[PDB]
């Protein structure tokens, strides 16, 4: 594939609204997307106050790192709170979701294998 290196301010990407049956109040920046990624993609999610990614599962993993704020993680059985500086590994097919129960935006990095899209 191509050579080189990209160095870019993540906020130079405009956060795009995500709106699905399960997702409301969330925006996403694609940092390293399908047009460039050899194996896996890097996105930066912003969860607005009250925003929700309701419980779901899918046949690929997540690797997440929380950049800003206090995030509620929805699990099969209950919920748990994380904050800036936490990482999360979600196994393939594990039930998960996210909610922002605070007044300010939450941001996290989210990487998935590229077979799961961007």
Residue nearer to a second copy on the CB measure, 90 or 106: 90
Q: What is the dihedral of CA 37, 34, 61, 100, to 10 degrees?
A: 120
Residue 54 lies near a second copy (rule: CB under 8 A): no
Site for a second copy (CB under 8 A): which residue of 20, 91, 104, 117?
A: 91
Residue nearer to a second copy on the CB measure, 7 or 21: 7
Question: Are 107 and 46 contacting, i.e. CB atoms less than 8 angstroms apart?
Answer: yes
Residue 5 lies near a second copy (rule: CB under 8 A): yes
Residue 117 lies near a second copy (rule: CB under 8 A): no
The residue numbers preceding gaps of C to N over 2.5 A in the chain are none
Q: Is 42 helix (H, G, I), strand (E, B) or coil?
A: strand
Residue 22 lies near a second copy (rule: CB under 8 A): no
Residue 65 lies near a second copy (rule: CB under 8 A): yes
* Beta strands 70-74; 62-68: pairing state: unpaired
Site for a second copy (CB under 8 A): which residue of 15, 37, 55, 70?
A: 37
């Amino acid at each position: 594939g191509p050579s080189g290196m990209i160095l870019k301010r993540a906020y130079d990407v405009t956060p795009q609204k995500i709106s699905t049956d399960k997702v409301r109040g969330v925006r996403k920046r694609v940092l390293i997307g399908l047009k460039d990624a050899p194996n896996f993609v890097m996105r930066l999610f912003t969860v607005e106050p009250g925003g929700l990614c309701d419980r779901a599962s899918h046949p690929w993993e997540h690797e997440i790192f929380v950049l800003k704020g206090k995030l509620t993680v929805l699990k099969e059985q209950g919920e748990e709170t994380v904050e800036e500086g936490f990482y999360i590994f979600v196994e393939p097919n594990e039930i998960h979701g996210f909610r922002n129960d605070t007044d300010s935006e939450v941001e996290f990095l989210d990487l998935i294998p590229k077979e799961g899209g961007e």
